[PDB]
Amino acid sequence: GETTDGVYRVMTRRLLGSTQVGVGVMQEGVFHTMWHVTKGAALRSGEGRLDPYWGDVKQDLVSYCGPWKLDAAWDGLSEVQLLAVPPGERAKNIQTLPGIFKTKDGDIGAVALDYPAGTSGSPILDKCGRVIGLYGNGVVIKNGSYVSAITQGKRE
Amino acid sequence: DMYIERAGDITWEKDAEVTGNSPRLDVALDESGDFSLVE
Numbered sequence: 001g002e003t004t005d006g007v008y009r010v011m012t013r014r015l016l017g018s019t020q021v022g023v024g025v026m027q028e029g030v031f032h033t034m035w036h037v038t039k040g041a042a043l044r045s046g047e048g049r050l051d052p053y054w055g056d057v058k059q060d061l062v063s064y065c066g067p068w069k070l071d072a073a074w075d076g077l078s079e080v081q082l083l084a085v086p087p088g089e090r091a092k093n094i095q096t097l098p099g100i101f102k103t104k105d106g107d108i109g110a111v112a113l114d115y116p117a118g119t120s121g122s123p124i125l126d127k128c129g130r131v132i133g134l135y136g137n138g139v140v141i142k143n144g145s146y147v148s149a150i151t152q153g154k155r156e
Numbered sequence: 157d158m159y160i161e162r163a164g165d166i167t168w169e170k171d172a173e174v175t176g177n178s179p180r181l182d183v184a185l186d187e188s189g190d191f192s193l194v195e
């Protein structure tokens with residue numbers, strides 16, 4: 001299958017037409033997405049099969065073919081880019097200064113950008129192009145607009 | 157049954173649309189991975 005580094009759409013044919021359920025990142029031969037996109041199911045890349053290797057419903061993350069590889073972190077200061085990949089629409093970088101989710105376990109970067117559900121798993125990058133996390137798990141605010149966490153895994 | 161299609165390179169693009177606010181939110185994370193506003 002296609003193992004080139006980059007960003008990919010996650011498609012299903014189990015509904016009407018070909019429906020985009022989310023987005024993910026291929027790095028060092030590992031495919032990285034959010035748990036709620038695949039529910040831990042196997043994926044196809046042409047003829048090639050991609051099997052789950054690691055996942056965690058609480059982190060809402062999952063890796064295929066190998067361990068989570070993405071370890072860059074928001075620096076807490078700089079603007080970032082959401083490389084949004086919406087259903088039916090070309091990949092598009094959106095530059096933003098993240099806000100903050102304050103939790104009992106620590107502070108997390110958050111990006112206040114609204115996109116369709118199927119955009120879940122789109123990568124968030126730093127100025128060096130390193131993926132600092134994925135878009136698609138967050139919260140609806142007073143306004144009615146969406147704030148996503150910058151969700152990052154740990155690399156062993 | 158689910159499949160992937162390549163959509164682009166992962167690159168910082170100089171002069172991209174700058175937008176979105178930067179809210180500080182008090183939130184809780186439950187066992188099911190659902191964030192909620194602590195008010």
Ligand SMILES: Cc1cc(CO)c2cccc(Cc3ccccc3C(=O)N3CC[C@@H](N)C3)c2n1
Nearest residue numbers: 036060115116117118120136137145146189190
């Ligand atoms: C409600 C909502 C609204 C908006 C826009 O205003 C969303 C925009 C992007 C992405 C999601 C997430 C999403 C996608 C597809 C199916 C479900 C969910 C969802 O809410 N979760 C299910 C497991 C939990 N960790 C998160 C959005 N969820």
